[PDB]
Structures are given as C-alpha cells and as structure tokens.
Amino acid sequence: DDIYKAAVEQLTEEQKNEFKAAFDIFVLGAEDGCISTKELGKVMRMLGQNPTPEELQEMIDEVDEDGSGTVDFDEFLVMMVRCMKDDSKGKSEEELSDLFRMFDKNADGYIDLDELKMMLQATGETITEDDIEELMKDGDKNNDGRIDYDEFLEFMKGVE
Amino acid sequence: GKRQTEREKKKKILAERRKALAIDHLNEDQLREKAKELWQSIHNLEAEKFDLQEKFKQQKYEINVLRNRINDNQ
Amino acid sequence: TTALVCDNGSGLVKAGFAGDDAPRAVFPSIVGRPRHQGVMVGMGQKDSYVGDEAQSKRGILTLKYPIEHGIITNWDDMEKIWHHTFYNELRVAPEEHPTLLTEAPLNPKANREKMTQIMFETFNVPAMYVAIQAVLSLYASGRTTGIVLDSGDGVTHNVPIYEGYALPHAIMRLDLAGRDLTDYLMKILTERGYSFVTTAEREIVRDIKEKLCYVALDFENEMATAASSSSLEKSYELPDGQVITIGNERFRCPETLFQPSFIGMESAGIHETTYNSIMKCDIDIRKDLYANNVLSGGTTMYPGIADRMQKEITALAPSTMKIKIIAPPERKYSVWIGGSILASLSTFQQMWISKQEYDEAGPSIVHRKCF
Amino acid sequence: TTALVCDNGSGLVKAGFAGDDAPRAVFPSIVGRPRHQGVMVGMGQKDSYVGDEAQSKRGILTLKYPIEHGIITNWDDMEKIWHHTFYNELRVAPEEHPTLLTEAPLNPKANREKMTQIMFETFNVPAMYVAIQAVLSLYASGRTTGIVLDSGDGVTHNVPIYEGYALPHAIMRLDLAGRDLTDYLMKILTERGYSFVTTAEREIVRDIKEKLCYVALDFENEMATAASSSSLEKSYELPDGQVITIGNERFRCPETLFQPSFIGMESAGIHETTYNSIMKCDIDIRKDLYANNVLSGGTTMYPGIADRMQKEITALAPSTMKIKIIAPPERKYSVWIGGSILASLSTFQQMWISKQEYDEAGPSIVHRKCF
Amino acid sequence: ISASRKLQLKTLMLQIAKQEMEREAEERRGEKGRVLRTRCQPLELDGLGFEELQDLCRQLHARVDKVDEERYDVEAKVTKNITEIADLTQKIYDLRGKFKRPTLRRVRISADAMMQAL
Ligand SMILES: Nc1ncnc2c1ncn2[C@@H]1O[C@H](COP(=O)(O)OP(=O)(O)O)[C@@H](O)[C@H]1O
Ligand SMILES: Nc1ncnc2c1ncn2[C@@H]1O[C@H](COP(=O)(O)OP(=O)(O)O)[C@@H](O)[C@H]1O
Ligand SMILES: [Mg+2]
Ligand SMILES: [Mg+2]
C-alpha cells in the first residue's frame, strides 16, 4: 500500500548503499534483474541482515510474477526493504496492556474478536476480503471465542 | 507475623501517625486560614482516594486478566 | 448471599460454599520456607509456599504444620493458610461472606477466641460461627442420635448425642490420630533398612500408610501368618525408584489405634473408649447408641476397620444388644458435608455471631449464648 | 554502558561484551619468555609474548600457564594476561566498564580476594562481580534445574541446582581435567617411539588429542578390536612432516576420565561422581536431576562422550528413572554465553560490587552479601 | 498474505487506541473534578460570625478526620491488594516467562564481520 511508497520516498542512505552494492553484484551489465533469489538471499546475508530461510523461501516464491525473471527495481527494492526490519519493537507491552484496558468494554478480563469488528466498524474503515475474515481469525488466533489480552498481543505484536 | 504489630500500625496511622491535631482554638483570620488549609488538604486527599479507587479497579481488572491467563494456561 | 463453610482440620484444609456435595478445594495445610541458599537470580522465588504448592517443591523446603493437636501453635502461619484459602483457592473476598469454622471438643479457649478475633479483624467477615466437629458429622449421616467417633489426623474424639441433646459429661477426647500413626510407621520401617528422617519424607511415609496399610481383623493370627508365608508383602515405588517391600508392617501401623501401648500411650484403644463413652451415658439410651455408632474422619478409612471395631465392641457389650457401625463411603468429607447442611438451614440463620455483637462484647462473645 | 564478561578459565581466556552470542577474543593463556640468547640487533624483541602471539613463536619460548588448577599460582603473569586482554584484544579501557569474572567452586579465598583487589586497584574498574562457573553454564541452557558437569581444562566440578536453589553440600570437585589428559597422552605416545618433552611440544600433543582422540562406547571391546584389525589407526602430520600413526592411544587417552586410576588418581570417574553428587541431594528432586543432566566445558567435546556417560549412569541409576544428557553444540563457550545472559539482566544490575563499597570494607567484601 | 493489510489494520488500531486514550483521560479528568466538587465542599469568605467560624471550623475538622481515616483505610487496602497483584504478576511470569528468561540475546552481530582480522 501507501506504506511502501512512503518508504521508497524516505530511502535511508545507509541501507541505500547496501542496496546499490546488491545492484553492482547482481547486475552484470545492462542486466534487467532476472531475480536470482539465491543471489538476493546471499546479498541479504552479506549485507549484515539475517533473513530467515523461511524469508528466503518467501522471496523465492514471491518473485518473477512477470514470469520473465527480469523485474523492475521498484517492486524488487520494495520487497527488499520491507523484508528488512525497519521499526522499533511495535509499541510497548505496557502500552498494549493499557490499550486493552481501554478496549475491554465487555469488562470481562478480555475483549472479543466480534468486539474488535464492532470497534473497527465504528472507526468507519473499509472491510473487504483482505479484511473481515482473517482479521478476526488472527485476533482470536487460538479461537477461544473472544480475544484474550495475550491474544490481542500476539495479533499485532512488533507492528508499528 | 505478630498481627498485633499490624493492628497497632493501622491504629497509629488512624490516630497518631495521621496528621491529627486540635486547631479550632484560634483567632478569626487565622482560624479561617487553618480551616481553608485543612479542607484543601483533605480535598487533595479526596483526589488521592478517588485515584485509589480508580487504580484498585485497574488492579481488579488486572487480576481478572490474571485468572483468565491462568485458566487458559492450564 | 452464600456462606463459606471452611474446616481447618489438621492435615487437610477443606473448604467450599454452603449447599454443595463436596468441598471445592482440598489441600494440605503446610507452610514451608526454603532452606538452601539459592543462586539463580530473578527466578521469582517466594519466601513461603503454602498449601498444595509446597507439596510439589517439597524437595527443598522444610514443611511444618501450623496445627499440632487440634490446637493452633503458630498463629502467623495459620493466618497465612486462611489468606491463601480465601483468596487463591476460592477467589472470594471474605468481606461479603459468612464463615463457619470447626473446632475439636475440649480445646483451649484462647485458641477459639483468637480464631474469632482474627476472622473479625484481619479478614473482616460479616459473621462467623464455630461448631464442634462431631455434631456436623452426625448431621451428614442424616441421623439425630448416635455416638460419633471422629478420628481425624490431629485428635480422635468421641461425642455421644441423643435426640439432639449432647451429653457433655461423656466426651472422651484422645490425642492419638493419623499423625502419630505416620510417625510410628516411619519408626517401624527402620526394621527393614529404610530410613526416612527429613520432614519432606514424612509425606512419603504418609503416602505409604494411605496406600498399603490395613487393619487386621485378628491381630495374632495375622502376625503368625505374615511370619510364615509371604502372601502379604506388597511393594511400593519411591519417588525415585528403589521399590520397597512392606511385610507385617502393613497391619502393625494402624493396630496402634486399638493398642495405644505401642507408641507408649497409656490409654485404651478406640475400641474401648467408645464403650466407656457409652457406659457413662444414662441407662435408657444405651441401646440406641449401640445401634447407631457412627464413624467419621480420615483415619477411619483403613480397609477392614468397620469389622474389627464391631467385633471388639460386640465382645465388650452385653450379648443381647445389636451393635451396628455406620461407615458411609464419604467418610473423609463427612464433617464438611454436615457443615454445608447446617449452614444451609433456615432455622440456623439467626445463630451467627454478627459483627456488631462482637464489637459490643469483645472476642469473649464466642463462649456466650452464641456458642 | 556495556559490561565486560571476562572468563579467565585455564587454558583459553574467553572475553567479550555482554549481550552477544560468542566471545569476541579467544586465545590461549600462556606467557612465554624467550630462552635463547639472541644475536640480531634492533629486531624489536620483547621480553614476554602473551596470548596468541606466543603460540606462533613457541619454537624459541618457554610457555608457562599462569593458572594451574583453577587457582592462580603466578600473579604477575595473570596481571599481564588481563592487561593484554583488556587493551589489545578488546581495546576498551577498563575505567568505563563493569567486569564479571568467573571462578571455580571450592577455590581458596585468597585467590578471589587478590583477584578483586587487582581489578579494583590496578585496572581500576567501576564494579566487578565474581560468579561460579557452573551457574552460568546452567543459564546458557535456558533451564532452571539440573546438575551441570563442567569439565574444563583445569578442574572438573559438578554443581547440582534445583529450582534456582543451589545445594552447597553436594558439590563434587575433582581435579582431573584436560591438562592431565594431555600429559597422559604425551606419556602413552612414548610406547610407539614418539617422544615429546619440551613445553612447546605439549601444544602439539594437545592438538593431537583434540583432533584424533574419541571416547569409546565400550572400553574392552575397543581394546580387543584395535588389537586385531587396523581400522582405527589414524595418521597425523607433525609441524615439520614425519607423519605419526596413533593406534589404540586414540580412546585410551580420554578413557582416563572414567577410570582415574590410569594416572594414579584414587577417585572415581566422571560417570560415578555425578551419581554420587545426585545421591547426596534430597530424595524428591532426584528425578529432575536425572532428567536434566547438563554437560559443559571444553573437555566434554570428545566425540561419543554423551553416549558413554548416559550408558554408565543408566547402569548405576534405578531402572525406572529416565536419564537424559543435555549436550548443546555450543559446549565450549557455554559458560561465557551464560555469563553474557546474566550480565544482560535487569534484575542483576544492582548486585555488582560498587567501588565505594570496596573502599569501605576492603577486599574481603567479596565473601559478604555481594557474593 | 499481503502485509499492507496489517499496515492498514494497525493504522486503524492506532487511531482507535489514541481515541480511547484521550477519551478515558478526559473522562477521568471530568469525573475527578465532579467528585472533588461534590465532596470538597467550598469554604466561604463571609456570612459566619467568629462563633460560627469556630463552629464550622471544628465541624469540618471532624469531617476532615472522617475522610482522612476513610482514605487512609482505602489506601491501605490499595497497598495490600497491590502487593497481591505484584505477587500474582510474579507467579504468572513464573507460569509463562520462566523458560522465556534465557531467550534474551543480541548475538552473531560483529564477529561475522571480522574475517580480515587475521
Ligand atoms: N484413604 C486413606 N487411608 C488411610 N488413611 C488415610 C486415608 N486418607 C487419609 N488418611 C489419613 O487421614 C488424615 C487426613 O485426615 P482428615 O480427616 O483430613 O483430618 P482433619 O480432621 O484434620 O481434616 C491423613 O493425614 C491420613 O494420614
Ligand atoms: N574439540 C575438542 N576436542 C577435544 N578436546 C578439546 C576440544 N576443544 C578443547 N578441548 C580441550 O579442552 C580444553 C579447553 O577447555 P576450556 O573449556 O577452554 O577450559 P576453561 O574452562 O579453562 O575455559 C583444551 O585444553 C583442550 O584440551
Ligand atoms: Mg476432622
Ligand atoms: Mg570453564
């Protein structure tokens, strides 16, 4: 969404040098970026980042949607920067505790995924296929019929 | 742990350790000043005990969460 | 609101709301401070584990019961036990619930007065009432007469009751109980090589006693049989392996009840103090007491005691009277079931010691009309 | 600021800043003065090469370890080693960094007091803390119970811990370790013709031991097999050629751990001092210690030791208990990883021995509450 | 699954969180002022004689003692249940975070970048 566009706008130069080193290493002369996912993963490892082998597989399986290997550096670098963590721990657990204190309108020691739906609807936000279903599925991820405090934590932990 | 000590502590804070003082034995302006001062101090104490009740509510909610986590954890 | 039927006991604290069938939370009454040094930092080590938590960390604790023989010897620990019982095992604040404690007969006054003072000052209950542990066990049987032998873990007492009129001059309280049987078993196990010394290993010996020991119908014949055959030797696996084999220690441990000379006590067994308690009663209610002998308490759960006791009393009693021993399967919680029934009665609802009454007469109110 | 987690050890000094995964600089702890005369002028020849520099010029030096068995026997050399560690391998002045040394259990007091006095007077650190080398190795495993066998290069010690409460009466410290195995290997190599005598060639024998030796699962069968076939003879190239072939010396060198009678020591092997250390513990925590036996230290890196030790303990222990031996792949640096974790804790941040405290009570502060 | 979904969800969640934060803060301020007003009854600058001054002064001294004892008592209750809450926090951490304690590390950071040292 707009987050990746903004991140593109606010390109950090310290990471920009690493990405251009990747450009130098992978590109072999007017190279249109065939997306060597092995090369991309080794580049991520070399540049100090610690991508998971699962992240490596995700990058393997989420590339070359054009089918021609050669990929615009725009979306490639969007994937590269977002795969790299750029955030601070996603708020504080005490902050989350106080927020849940606000959000326990049911006052039953927890909140509800249905309560989450009602509050988000009260926020007047778009609900779609990307919304609605998996939002409540992962809010009450353990599927207790309601979102416990730890469930609310694990729904959106480490996210800005 | 010698609940006699706890009882005597409570009673001292009730009567001795609390700022208890006979003061309505003074001249006019001074008496008004002292009355205003004590009333304002007790008003601040009203604010303090209102927050005491508020945070006690919060602790009750926290123990509700605590029991919830306990039950979900076993 | 509902009443809290607590039952301090000595060895197992049994509690629960009035009007149910079984206590909600049953857990040993032990408070054990750690005894070693402790090197891990931030492990969250507390200073005293009470209740059932200290039966799992007992390897590094020094468990000590706060109730010796009915009486309470360590008031701080007992207060800690009560606080745990109210807040963590039932999770009901005591400010909104009447309480019904239980107390053995013939106990020191100061114990009862301190109990009521604690309940009214520290926990600040609305109203509490103290009842004798045998009348409740008679409630639970659904009788109204009968002589009840409530052999707990601290003290064994034998209260005869007729038509609802208790006979205060015929109560025979004897201080042999389950704890002395545990100590005697731990002392006779040393005759095979197994030495249990630590206060934590007393729990292991208690488990051995519960699971293996039984009361012999005839003592001499069993002693002769166990000394010739080997059909009695039952084995048991310690908490670490190294199984042990108990021979004629099986029926010698609970035999102490009928021959208190084994542990050096002078008095007569539980088979003869019941007959003496009956004979102190009037001559016209002895038949009913003979026919309605009630057993209660934990220690009367030994397999085969309801027959040995009947045989002994039939030997002592006149040949014409019929001797019947009531041994309900819910023996252990009989006192608490009776307590629940008593607290659920409408006629009893005005016998509680209301707090304003305590404020006017002090803790000595318990000995007064509100008994 | 960040803390310096130094770990003196005996054989390899491991150091690094708190909060990382591996020590920053690992180098042998040897200080070797030159022994020949020296004829080139202006070559810039120093008077003592310490650390990893003296493992490259060892041909003309006389290396001598400053730590014999845990204890420190030559304080000037140890001070030199510490100075090198701080200034050249980490390049951080000690005036701005807390330090966390490590010490074996049951060591002389004077050693620890002199260590703290040096750290506070010569290097002038802000605050230092001394920790037992086994508790850290238990930290690194992420456990909170378990009995850890930390077979270093100087001394092998076996500290049992339960629920964070260390058991001071069950620590079994044995002075057989990697150095004695090196000497015994150097002594049995002479049975084929290879003679290593110089203190420099002890390093070559150590390399042979590290690269070739392994612990046999069953000793007699291996002795019989190596005496008939020749499938075990592995060759190794000295620092100058002349390859050597090690026969049944391969599994006879590390077998000394389980039979200390080989080097004339009386005591029982590391397979039986662990069982003895367990049996001294209370009867209720033996199952947990059986299930969480932890290995650490360098010398426990022999290929095939985690199976031999488990077989031996299973032979000794009761048949019902489950015996499990935790052998993490990062065994060598386990103590230092645990030290980093402990120094990174917030709860631990107030346990350091602050300098003003030392100024008020002298070096004997270490035995006091700040342990 | 698109992470833009999570980004949008967190935007809405942050909006809800801030709204409820300001809402509860404002509620607390208003209710606090209301309670103080209805309880801290004003003291007046005129209308009482010296005898009336003394009378109302000692009456409010008694009222001050009443509310001071009440608030100290409830403060003691707050402290004791707060100790209990702390104990339960320790216990629940022992329930959950006992094994998570060693998990805290910052590792394999610099030594991976030290191949040119030799
Ligand atoms: N199934 C059993 N078999 C034999 N003895 C038992 C059994 N259950 C409990 N006991 C003994 O009874 C004691 C518990 O008695 P209990 O009735 O709880 O005492 P109290 O009157 O204090 O509640 C235990 O200490 C144990 O020694
Ligand atoms: N891979 C290995 N295989 C066998 N033995 C080893 C190995 N690595 C180290 N050792 C032995 O362990 C010793 C190092 O032990 P270490 O844990 O460094 O001792 P310390 O506790 O003093 O740090 C060396 O002297 C060596 O004999
Ligand atoms: Mg009883
Ligand atoms: Mg070591």
From Swiss-Prot, chain A:
Pfam families documented for this protein: EF-hand_7, EF-hand_8
Superkingdom of this protein's organism: Eukaryota
UniProt KW Transport keyword: no
Gene Ontology terms describing biological process: cardiac muscle contraction; diaphragm contraction; muscle filament sliding; regulation of ATP-dependent activity; regulation of muscle filament sliding speed; response to metal ion; transition between fast and slow fiber; ventricular cardiac muscle tissue morphogenesis
Stretches assigned to the EF-hand domain: 15-50, 51-86, 91-126, 127-160
Family: Belongs to the troponin C family.
PANTHER family: MYOSIN LIGHT CHAIN 1, 3 (PTHR23048), TROPONIN C1, SLOW SKELETAL AND CARDIAC TYPE (PTHR23048:SF47)
Protein name per its UniProtKB record: Troponin C, slow skeletal and cardiac muscles
Origin species: Mus musculus
Swiss-Prot record, chain B:
Keyword set, alphabetical order: Acetylation, Muscle protein, Phosphoprotein
Molecular functions (GO terms): actin binding; structural constituent of cytoskeleton; tropomyosin binding; troponin C binding; troponin I binding
Post-translational note: Phosphorylation at Thr-5 by PRKCA induces significant reduction in myofilament calcium sensitivity and actomyosin ATPase activity.
GO biological process: atrial cardiac muscle tissue morphogenesis; cardiac muscle contraction; heart development; muscle contraction; muscle filament sliding; negative regulation of ATP-dependent activity; positive regulation of ATP-dependent activity; regulation of heart contraction
Biased composition (Basic and acidic residues): 1-13
GO cellular component term of the entry, any: troponin complex
PTM annotation (Phosphothreonine): residues: 5
UniProt name for this protein: Troponin T, cardiac muscle
Species of provenance: Mus musculus (Mouse)
Source organism phylogeny: Eukaryota, Metazoa, Chordata, Craniata, Vertebrata
From Swiss-Prot, chains C, D:
Modified residues (Methionine (R)-sulfoxide): 40, 43
Gene: Actc1
This protein's UniProt keywords: Acetylation, ATP-binding, Cytoplasm, Cytoskeleton, Hydrolase, Methylation, Muscle protein, Nucleotide-binding, Oxidation
Protein name (database record): Actin, alpha cardiac muscle 1
Catalytic activity field: ATP + H2O = ADP + phosphate + H(+)
Taxonomic lineage from the root: Eukaryota, Metazoa, Chordata, Craniata, Vertebrata
Originating species: Mus musculus
Modified residues (N6-methyllysine): 80
Further facts: In vertebrates 3 main groups of actin isoforms, alpha, beta and gamma have been identified. The alpha actins are found in muscle tissues and are a major constituent of the contractile apparatus. The beta and gamma actins coexist in most cell types as components of the cytoskeleton and as mediators of internal cell motility.
Enzymatic class: hydrolase
Family: Belongs to the actin family.
Domain of life: Eukaryota
DNA-binding is among the record's keywords: no
MF GO annotations: ATP binding; hydrolase activity; microfilament motor activity; myosin binding
Record's comment on post-translational modification: Oxidation of Met-40 and Met-43 by MICALs (MICAL1, MICAL2 or MICAL3) to form methionine sulfoxide promotes actin filament depolymerization. MICAL1 and MICAL2 produce the (R)-S-oxide form. The (R)-S-oxide form is reverted by MSRB1 and MSRB2, which promotes actin repolymerization. Monomethylation at Lys-80 (K86me1) regulates actin-myosin interaction and actomyosin-dependent processes. Demethylation by ALKBH4 is required for maintaining actomyosin dynamics supporting normal cleavage furrow ingression during cytokinesis and cell migration.
From Swiss-Prot, chain E:
GO biological process: cardiac muscle contraction; heart development; intracellular calcium ion homeostasis; muscle filament sliding; regulation of cardiac muscle contraction by calcium ion signaling; regulation of muscle contraction; regulation of smooth muscle contraction; regulation of systemic arterial blood pressure by ischemic conditions
Phosphothreonine found at: 11, 38, 89, 103
Modified residues (Phosphoserine): 2, 4, 110
Involved in TNI-TNT interactions, annotated site positions: 40, 57
Post-translational modification: Phosphorylation by STK4/MST1 alters its binding affinity to TNNC1 (cardiac Tn-C) and TNNT2 (cardiac Tn-T). Phosphorylated at Ser-2 and Ser-4 by PRKCE; phosphorylation increases myocardium contractile dysfunction.
Annotated region described as Involved in binding TNC and actin, given as residue ranges: 89-110
Record-level GO cellular component terms: cardiac myofibril; cardiac Troponin complex; cytoplasm; sarcomere
GO molecular function, one term: troponin T binding
Keywords annotated in UniProt: Acetylation, Actin-binding, Muscle protein, Phosphoprotein
Region Involved in binding TNC, annotated ranges: 1-39
Domain of life, source organism: Eukaryota
Function: Troponin I is the inhibitory subunit of troponin, the thin filament regulatory complex which confers calcium-sensitivity to striated muscle actomyosin ATPase activity.
Similarity annotation: Belongs to the troponin I family.
Subunit and interaction comment: Interacts with TRIM63. Binds to actin and tropomyosin. Interacts with STK4/MST1.
Protein name: Troponin I, cardiac muscle
Organism in which the protein naturally occurs: Mus musculus
Primary gene name: Tnni3
Span covered, complete protein: 42 to 159 of 211
